[PDB]
Amino acid sequence: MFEGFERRLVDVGDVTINCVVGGSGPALLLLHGFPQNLHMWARVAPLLANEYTVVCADLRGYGGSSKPVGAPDHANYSFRAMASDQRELMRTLGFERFHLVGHARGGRTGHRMALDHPDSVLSLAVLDIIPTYVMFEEVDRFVARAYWHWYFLQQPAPYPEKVIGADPDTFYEGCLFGWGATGADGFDPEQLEEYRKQWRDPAAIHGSCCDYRAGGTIDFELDHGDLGRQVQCPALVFSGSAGLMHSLFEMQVVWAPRLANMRFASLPGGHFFVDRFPDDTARILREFLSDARS
Amino acid sequence: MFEGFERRLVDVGDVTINCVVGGSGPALLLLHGFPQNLHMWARVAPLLANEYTVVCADLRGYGGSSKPVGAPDHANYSFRAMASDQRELMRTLGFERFHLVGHARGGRTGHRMALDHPDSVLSLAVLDIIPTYVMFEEVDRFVARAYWHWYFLQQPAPYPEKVIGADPDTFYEGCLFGWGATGADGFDPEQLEEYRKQWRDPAAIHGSCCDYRAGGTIDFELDHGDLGRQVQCPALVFSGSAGLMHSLFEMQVVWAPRLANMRFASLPGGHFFVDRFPDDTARILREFLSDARS
Ligand SMILES: [Mg+2]
Ligand SMILES: [Mg+2]
């Protein structure tokens, strides 16, 4: 995987970020979600590398990046903290400005990055997410049942860590196949094994739980403070039309108040559609990035 | 435990209900909750047996009772079905009418029994519960986080069964100590060991998951259909004032429209207050039952 890409472990302050870098042209940062890592982009990234300098990075708590113990207030796993790591990564790699594509947790990281440092983000694509604020503020019995993990993963350490730790493969496969609504046949064996390595790492189990703990506290509060602000750069809301969130919310309705320049796309998959549709994901991203640059 | 009580396995139709029966006087049915069984009453029941014929029974899916495989629509684990078992148990024991005290799932079973067959229920005590309808209809980010299990346990079989099955002690201890807000020191070791036997029983893991699956579907729908009906018999709403539900809702406000003759009481414990305060639980129930009879 990632043939010809350079593998780098980059110190960005108090953490180290694992990434791969390949291609040439404008910078494009690809950020993964949960329970995955930069390997979700193993097929997409080489496709886009003919036109972009593609950086795929692991979020703090995930993959090969640092996974500090979560602070009592979860602040070291906020999307603000996660975004700072990634912006600093790009700067260290020589990129003051870059296009940003984020799935799930990476999309939330991107939204926060664009709010905190608008000048760094040339365009923003958010893949299969409803805004964090909306997820919580507009929760009902259907939303809570569909994305049950938003509540389980908030339970205080070490409870979810120990429950998950007893059988990580069962737990996380249920994330892919259940709330993730993406059938097993849609996953490439090589990429799936990279996810499995992380699933079995207790430090990653903890880091990802802390991400969710922050999600329901510090992130919710920061997002609340920013209500009414719109990201100004070109944005793409790119969903899985066979996923749970595409059907309980209208993507266009929840994102319009947050994005001044919004385009939409979807693929007929679940939350983990990038795993099943890498060529079509690259196609849609390529078109959007071209539009954004025009 | 339950010295002097008769132990009975009673066929009530398509299931067998496990129970213990002691004392003399009017019938008093005590129904447990989750993740417990009739042993939650091991200290309360002998105290009340000087004035009541006390029957402590295991709900279907729990303890020593039948635990059928859940139907696709969960209807065989509805509170209606659970109530029918217990009403028939009492009839077989010679009681057409009886006082009913239910904690949690048993309280919900009791409420449904009083709605379906009001003539059978002489008085109703509901211990540390907010009505199912309210739990779901009025869910918000706080309620969903507090009682996260209401969503996790609804996930389709066999997913929660397998997650729990990998380490039932960790999982269920987290129910007692976490959302249950009842510290370990409040549990009698003898009672705890009987809970633990059930925790490790795969048939009980499944049965209790099905209870929650019905809880969010058939039970919610049946309850919705009965909105505006009031239970007419004397009723007691009896909460743990140090528990999560007592503080997230006003017990008296959520129950008042549902109960025409309502009294309220509390003890300074969490959801599992009966474990820590058996003598005081018996005292409060005894006073209520005396008042109800008058
Ligand atoms: Mg976060
Ligand atoms: Mg039920």
Q: At what angle do helices A202-214 and A189-199 cross, to 10 degrees?
A: 80
Can you tell me the distance from the alpha carbon of B36 to that of A182, in angstroms, rounded to the nearest whole number?
35
| B107 neighbors B126 (Cβ within 8 angstroms) | yes
Measured CA to CA, the distance from residue A128 to residue A239 in angstroms comes to: 4
Which residues in chain A are closer than 8 Å to B140, comparing Cβ atoms? 139
For chain A, list residues whose CB is within 8 angstroms of any CB belonging to chain B. Answer: 136-137, 139-141, 144-145, 148, 150-152, 154-156, 159, 162-163, 166-167, 170-171, 174, 178, 216, 220
3-state SS assignment for residue B3: coil
Q: Calculate the CA B132 to chain-centre distance.
A: 13
Nearest-by-Cβ selection for A170 from B136, B152, B162? B162
Sequential DSSP letters for B33-98: -TT--GGGGTTHHHHHTTTSEEEEEPPTTSTTS--PPPPTT-GGGSHHHHHHHHHHHHHHTT-SSE
**Residue B61 half-sphere exposure, CB side, CA atoms within 13 Å?**
31
Enumerate the β-bridge partners of residue B124.
B100, B235
**C-alpha radius of gyration, chain B, whole number:** 17
Experimental method: X-ray
Q: What is the 3-state secondary structure (H, E, C) of chain A?
A: CCCCCEEEEEECCCCEEEEEEEECCCEEEEECCCCCCHHHHCCHHHHHCCCCEEEEECCCCCCCCCCCCCCCCCHHHCHHHHHHHHHHHHHHCCCCCEEEEEECHHHHHHHHHHHHCHHHEEEEEEECCCCHHHHHHCCCHHHHHHCCHHHHCCCCCCHHHHHHHCCHHHHHHHHHHHHCCCCHHHCCHHHHHHHHHHHCCHHHHHHHHHHHHHHHHHHHHHHHHCCCCCECCCEEEEEECCCHHHHHCCHHHHHCCCECCEEEEEECCCCCHHHHCHHHHHHHHHHHHHHHHC
Find the helix or strand (DSSP H, E) in which B22 lies.
strand B16-23
Q: CB within 8 A of B14, min separation 6: which ones?
A: B66, B68
- Which residue of chain B comes nearest to A215, CA vs CA? B141
Q: Which residues of B touch A220 (CB under 8 A)?
A: 141
Residues linked to residue B23 through DSSP beta bridges, in sequence order: B53
Specify which residues B184 forms β-bridges with.
none
Q: Is A141–B137 a contact, with Cβ atoms under 8 angstroms apart?
A: yes
Beta bridge partners of B102: B31, B126
Which of A159, A205, A212, A218 best probes binding to B when mutated, by most B CB atoms within 10 angstroms? Answer: A159
3-state DSSP of B178-215: HHCCCCHHHCCHHHHHHHHHHHCCHHHHHHHHHHHHHH
Place of tokens 């217990």: B86
Q: With contact defined as beta carbons under 8 Å apart, do A244 and A181 qualify? A: yes
B218-225 and B79-92 helices, crossing angle to 10°: 80
Distances in Å between the alpha carbon of B261 and those of A27, B129, B221, B288?
70, 17, 25, 12
CA distance A99 to A289: 8
Q: What is the dihedral of CA A65, A69, A72, A75, to 10 degrees?
A: -20
Measured distance CA(A265)–CA(A263) in Å, rounded: 7
Ligand 1 midpoint to CA A218 (Å) = 8
CB A38 within 8 A of CB A55: no
Return all residues near B252 (Cβ < 8 A) that are at least 6 apart.
B237, B262, B264
Q: What is the resolution of this structure in A?
A: 1.2
Torsion of CA B247, B250, B252, B258, to 10 degrees: -120
Q: What architecture is domain A1-294?
A: 3-Layer(aba) Sandwich (3.40)
Nearest listed ligand to the Cα of residue A33: 1
Supply angle C-alpha A258, A113, B143, rounded to 5: 65
Residues A144, B145: C-beta atoms closer than 8 Å: no
In the DSSP assignment, the letter for residue B156 is P
CA dist A83 and A148 (Å) reads 25
Structure tokens at B227: 């909105």
- Cβ–Cβ of B163/A174 closer than 8 Å? yes
Contact call for residues A191 and A58 (beta carbons, < 8 A): no
Of A139, A163, A170, the CB nearest to B144: A139
**How many CB atoms within 10 Å of residue B203?**
15
In 3-state terms, what secondary structure has residue B145?
helix
Question: Would you say B182 and B195 are in contact if contact means Cβ atoms under 8 Å apart?
Answer: no
Contacting residues of A for B216, CB less than 8 Å apart: 141, 145
Count of CB contacts below 8 A, A vs B? 72
Contacting residues for B293 by C-beta, under 8 A, at least 6 apart: B26, B123
